[PDB]
Every structure is written in C-alpha cells, then in structure tokens.
Design a protein around this motif. Structure first.
Motif, PDB file in Angstrom:
ATOM      1  N   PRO B  21       0.820  -1.224   0.000  1.00 16.36           N
ATOM      2  CA  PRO B  21       0.000   0.000   0.000  1.00 16.36           C
ATOM      3  C   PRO B  21       0.849   1.267   0.000  1.00 16.36           C
ATOM      4  CG  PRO B  21      -0.045  -1.059   2.148  1.00 16.36           C
ATOM      5  CD  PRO B  21       0.524  -2.053   1.185  1.00 16.36           C
ATOM      6  N   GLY B  22       0.473   2.212  -0.863  1.00 10.05           N
ATOM      7  CA  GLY B  22       1.116   3.510  -0.939  1.00 10.05           C
ATOM      8  C   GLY B  22       2.480   3.538  -1.600  1.00 10.05           C
ATOM      9  N   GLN B  23       2.629   2.864  -2.738  1.00 13.65           N
ATOM     10  CA  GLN B  23       3.883   2.851  -3.481  1.00 13.65           C
ATOM     11  C   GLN B  23       3.773   3.679  -4.759  1.00 13.65           C
ATOM     12  OE1 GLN B  23       6.876   1.621  -2.487  1.00 13.65           O
ATOM     13  NE2 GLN B  23       5.850   1.192  -0.535  1.00 13.65           N
ATOM     14  N   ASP B  36      -4.376   2.596   0.945  1.00 21.39           N
ATOM     15  CA  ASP B  36      -3.876   2.413   2.307  1.00 21.39           C
ATOM     16  C   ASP B  36      -4.813   1.568   3.166  1.00 21.39           C
ATOM     17  OD1 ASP B  36      -1.665   3.899   1.655  1.00 21.39           O
ATOM     18  OD2 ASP B  36      -2.387   5.753   2.581  1.00 21.39           O
TER      19      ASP B  36
END
Lengths: 49, 48
Positions: B21-23, B36
């Motif tokens: 999550p959140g890349q 997220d």
C-alpha cells in the motif's frame, strides 16, 4: 518528530510512514491542551473562593 | 472473510517491491494501485 509542520510531513514521507509522525504531533498538542484546561479549572476554583 | 479477488498477472523483479500500500512505480501508478485501507496478501512464484 522530525518537522513540526503538518504540511511538511504530508509532502515528505510515504502515506504509511507519514501517519506515524503526524499522530505524534496531534498527541503532543492534545497533551498541551489538557495541560491548559486543567490549570484553568483550578484557577476558576481559586477565583471562586 | 466474505470473498477473495485473485488477479493474475506477471510482474518483473524490479516492480515486485512496489506491490504494497502507498507505493509508486511504472505498474504501481498507471496500472495497478494499492490503497492504504487495502488488506490482503501477495503470493509470488518464479516462472523462468
């Protein structure tokens, strides 16, 4: 925290990583707010007597 | 849990660290993103 500005941590760290450092600042501002309300209730009791 | 969504794709070893999550990546921006609040697991195997 590394920076005390809430707009800086949103502009630097990853969104998993930025939620740690923002929540350190919100907890630190609520403990300073809990310090202020506790003193003003006691000074309201000293001005009542 | 209620249901599972299995997505079948082949990703090279440069972009396998960007599945989280959140890349940010080539596939992790304009193809397949993980929010997220996403919850799940990643299973990989060597097809060479």
């Amino acid at each position: 925290a590394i920076s005390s500005v809430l707009n800086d941590i949103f502009s630097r760290l990853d969104p998993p990583e930025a939620e740690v450092q923002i929540d350190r600042l919100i907890t630190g501002r609520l403990q300073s707010l809990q310090t202020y309300v506790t003193q003003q209730l006691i000074r309201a009791a000293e001005i009542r007597a | 849990f209620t249901n599972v969504y299995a997505d079948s794709f082949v990703i090279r070893g440069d972009e396998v660290r960007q599945i989280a999550p959140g890349q940010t990546g080539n596939i992790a921006d304009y193809n397949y993103k993980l929010p997220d609040d996403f919850t799940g697991c990643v299973i990989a195997w060597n097809s060479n």
